[PDB]
Amino acid sequence: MTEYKLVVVGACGVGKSALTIQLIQNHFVDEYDPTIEDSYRKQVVIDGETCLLDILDTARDQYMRTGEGFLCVFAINNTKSFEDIHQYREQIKRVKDSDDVPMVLVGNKCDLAARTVESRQAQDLARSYGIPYIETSAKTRQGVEDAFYTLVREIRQH
Ligand SMILES: *CCC(=O)N1CCN(c2nc(=O)n(-c3c(C)ccnc3C(C)C)c3nc(-c4c(O)cccc4F)c(F)cc23)[C@@H](C)C1
Ligand SMILES: Nc1nc2c(ncn2[C@@H]2O[C@H](COP(=O)(O)OP(=O)(O)O)[C@@H](O)[C@H]2O)c(=O)[nH]1
Ligand SMILES: [Mg+2]
């Protein structure tokens, strides 16, 4: 049984914790301590293979060095968090000395109306990085499994 080391990064308040908690426990957390950084484990079957996911919810050096894939999370109603994504990717590139790192761009809070980041904008950013873009709602669970499992499938191409 395989293990995949995943790291969830992005600006404050985008839903890093809510996404991770939704994935693990199938529950939307209305407020989760913004200072709690911890790693969580989750047994999954992905394309017929039993895997143990090891997920760091950032809020650390060891996981950046050995982490195999990163979720770059912004919120679709938080333009600053989207603009911040560049800086998070630059930090990952430095720690990995590579711009060929498994990553998925995640636009969270898709259940909220009147988005300020268009899907097109995010698709264009992900295209420039050569990575997938996936929209999620930690509230409704839409796309949550897709985001984490796609990151696994990106790691497997590596
Ligand atoms: C609401 C609280 C919250 O969720 N936070 C998330 C973690 N975090 C954070 N802040 C931050 O300034 N950097 C960072 C550093 C330390 C240096 C340069 N740039 C940045 C940002 C602007 C990209 C964070 N950097 C990382 C990170 C490192 O250090 C290495 C590789 C990959 C990374 F994502 C990180 F995980 C969190 C950073 C604050 C906002 C609190
Ligand atoms: N409506 C909605 N709210 C969300 C979603 N994800 C997170 N939130 C809310 O956004 C706030 C910040 O979420 P949190 O997980 O703590 O963000 P973090 O700082 O990146 O860990 C919380 O009040 C969450 O309830 C979502 O998909 N939809
Ligand atoms: Mg958090």
| Method underlying the structure | X-ray
Q: Is the CB of 79 under 6 A from ligand 1?
A: no
**8 closest CA partner among 158, 128, 142, 136:** 136
Q: Provide the CATH number for the domain around residue 59.
A: 3.40.50.300
- Cβ–ligand 2 distance for 15 under 6 Å, the answer yes
Nearest ligand to the C-alpha atom of residue 88: 1
Number of independent structural domains in the chain: 1
How, if at all, do strands 38-46 and 49-57 pair?
A: antiparallel
| Tokens describing residue 4 | 């995949």
CA of 72 to the centre of ligand 3 (A): 14
Q: Which of 152, 66, 73 is nearest to 117 (CA)?
A: 73
Q: How far is the CA of 14 from the centre of ligand 2 (A)?
A: 6
What residue numbers bound the domain in which 65 lies?
A: 2-156
Give the DSSP per-residue string, 60-117: -HHHHHH--EEEEEEETT-HHHHHHHHHHHHHHHHHHT-S---EEEEEE-TTSSS-SS
**Beta bridge partner(s), residue 70:** 7, 103
